[PDB]
Amino acid sequence: EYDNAIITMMNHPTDAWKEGQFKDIITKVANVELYYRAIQFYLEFKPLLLNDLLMVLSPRLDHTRAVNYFSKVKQLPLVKPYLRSVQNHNNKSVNESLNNLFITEEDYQALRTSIDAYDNFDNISLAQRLEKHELIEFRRIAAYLFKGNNRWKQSVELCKKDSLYKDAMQYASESKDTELAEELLQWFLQEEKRECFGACLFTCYDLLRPDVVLETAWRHNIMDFAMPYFIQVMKEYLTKVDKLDASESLRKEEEQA
Amino acid sequence: TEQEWREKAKKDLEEWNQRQSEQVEKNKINNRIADKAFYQQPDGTEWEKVAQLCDFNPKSSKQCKDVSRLRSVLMSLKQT
C-alpha cells in the first residue's frame, strides 16, 4: 500500500493529492528520488508546507541535488531553514549557497561568522565580491580573507587604497611582517597623515631599526611622533645596555672560579 | 485545482520577493548612512588630532618589545 499510497497521492493532482500523509511511509523507501518527487510536487502546489518534510527528511538525504533543485526553483530563501539545518556540514554547495545568500543579503556580520565556521570555498571570487560590496566592512573582509588565503601585502595594500582612516594602520598591525612597512610607511609620510605616524610605525614596531627612522626624520627635518619614538629607542636601548652591564658583571665575577 | 495552486505559489513567490526587495533597500540605506559615517572624519589641538584622525590603541597586546613609554605619552604628550 506504500507504493499505492504514493501513487494515490501523486496520481491525481486534480482531485486526490495530500501534503502531510507522505511523512510516514518514507522510512522504508529505498530510493531518495521519491522524496525529491514529493518535495517538487509540493513546491508545485504547496511550497509553504515544505518545512515539515525538511524536518522529517533530515537523516536520509542527498543534500547535493536537494540544494541544486532549490536553486533551480530559486526558493533558496524559502528552503533557508533547511539550509540552517544542513550548513553544519561545511560542504562546497551549501557554503557557496549561503555565501550568495549573504551577497544578495548584503550581510557581513553573520557572513563573517559563517565563513569563520565554514571554509569549503576559495578566496579569490569572495574577495572580488566583497571588495566591491559598498561597505568598508565588506571590502575589509575581502582583505581579511587574504591572510585567510595567506597572501598579505594586498589586503593592507587595499587599506592603503581606501581604508586609510586608521584602517590602513588597522591592517598594518596584522601585516606582522618586515621589509614592507619601511617603504609603505614612507609613502604614508608622503601625504601628511603622518600626524599619527608614531602609532603608524608602532602598530608594526616589532622589527624596526631606528637608524632609517633617524635618517627620514632628518630628510623632512621631522621630529614629532619621532621624539616619542626617539624616547622609545633610547629607553629600550637604556634597558638593553643596563641588562648588558649586569650580565657582564655576572660573567666577570664568575670567571674567577 | 492545479491552476489555482500554481497561482497561489506565484502569489507566495511575489509576496516573498517584495519583502526581499524591501529588506535589501532597508539594509542598503543602513549601509548608506553607515558610509556617511565612514565619510565624516578627517581623512592640545595636536593631541586632539592624534586622537581624532588616527587614534592609537593602548591595549594589552604590547608584547612586541616591552614598550612602556606609551603609558606616559598618552598622558605626557600624545592625546594630552
Numbering used by the authors:
A (entry chain K): 1370 to 1626
B (entry chain N): 124 to 166, 189 to 225
Article excerpt on this structure:
Clathrin-mediated endocytosis (CME) is a vital multistep process in all eukaryotes in which plasma membrane cargo proteins are first concentrated into a patch by clathrin adaptors, which are themselves clustered by interaction with a polymeric clathrin scaffold. The most abundant clathrin adaptor is the 300-kDa heterotetrameric adaptor protein 2 (AP2) complex, consisting of α, β2, μ2, and σ2 subunits. AP2 plays a central role in CME through binding plasma membrane phosphatidylinositol 4,5-bisphosphate [PtdIns(4,5)P2], the two most common cargo motifs (YxxΦ and [ED]xxxL[LI]), clathrin, and other regulatory/accessory proteins [reviewed in (1)]. Here, we used cryo–electron microscopy, tomography, and subtomogram averaging to determine structures, interactions, and arrangements of clathrin and AP2 at the key steps of coat assembly, from AP2 in solution to membrane-assembled clathrin-coated vesicles (CCVs).
We determined the structure of clathrin above AP2 in both the YxxΦ and YxxΦ/[ED]xxxL[LI] cargo–containing liposomes by subtomogram averaging: The structures were the same and thus were combined for further analysis. The CLC region that contacts CHC is well resolved, as are most of the leg and the helical hub of CHC. This positions the β2 appendage such that its C-terminal platform subdomain is freely accessible to the Fxx[FL]xxxR helical motifs on the unstructured portions of secondary adaptors such as autosomal recessive hypercholesterolemia (ARH) protein, arrestins, and epsins rather than being blocked as speculated. We now see that auxilin would occupy a cavity bounded by the β2 appendage, an NTD, and clathrin ankles.
